[PDB]
Amino acid sequence: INKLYSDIDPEMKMDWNKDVSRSLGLRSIKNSLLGIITTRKGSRPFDPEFGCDLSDQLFENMTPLTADTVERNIESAVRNYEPRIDKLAVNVIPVYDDYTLIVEIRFSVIDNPDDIEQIKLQLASS
C-alpha cells in the first residue's frame, strides 16, 4: 500500500535519476498531516476553514481545558481534510517552561486499520 497515495515530495528534492523526488505512501500522509496542522486558519486562498488555528495567548497558557480545547481542533481539523486515516487519536502535551505544545498523534491508514503508528509534533513561539 506504500505504492498507494503517491504524492510529490513536499521539498521537491532532487531524486536520483533526476525526476521529482517523492514522498512515498504513508510518507505523504504524514506530510499532508504535517502540512494541515501548522497552517494558520484562513490562510487557504478560498478556504478560510483550513488549517488548525493557534492563539499564542491560549498557546501561552495551558490548562487541561485549554489543552482539551486544542486537542479537539487538531482531531477535528485532521478529520475533515484527511480521509486516509481511519482510527486517529491525538495526544497533546503542553510544556510549561517555554510554553510549547508537543502533540502526539496515533492514527491508522484505511488499508491497515489495525496497525498503529504515531507522530511527534511540537509547537512554540509563545
Binding site: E11, M12, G35, T39, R40, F50
Partner: protein, 99 residues
C-alpha cells in the same frame, strides 16, 4: 518602467506552510508566475497594459499598422513609416473633423 510581475504575492496566494521557505516546489511554482506575468507578452502583463497600449503612440502598440493610412502611405522609409503612422492615429480626429 517595469510592470511588476505578480511574483511578490506568492507568499499570500498559497498558504505559507505549503511554500516551505526555499523549496524547488515553491521556486517551481514561482517560475510559473514568471511565465504568466513578465515582460512584454505574458498573459497578465499581456492584458494589463493592453488598454494602455491602445493610444497608439506608446511602445508595443499594434494599431496604425492595422489600418489604412499605415497600409497605403507608400511612404517608403519603413522605419519612420511607423512613426508617421500611429502619430496620425494618435489624434487622427481633427483630420476627419476638418476633412
Amino acid at each position: 518602467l517595469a510592470d511588476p510581475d505578480l511574483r511578490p504575492l506568492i507568499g499570500t496566494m498559497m498558504p505559507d506552510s505549503y511554500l516551505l521557505q526555499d523549496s524547488n516546489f515553491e521556486a517551481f511554482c514561482e517560475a510559473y508566475i514568471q511565465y504568466l506575468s513578465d515582460g512584454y507578452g505574458t498573459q497578465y502583463n499581456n492584458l494589463r497594459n493592453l488598454i494602455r497600449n491602445q493610444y497608439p503612440r506608446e511602445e508595443h502598440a499594434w494599431e496604425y499598422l492595422w489600418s489604412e493610412i499605415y497600409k497605403r502611405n507608400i511612404y517608403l522609409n519603413a522605419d519612420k513609416r511607423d512613426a508617421v503612422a500611429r502619430f496620425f492615429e494618435s489624434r487622427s480626429y481633427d483630420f476627419y473633423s476638418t476633412k
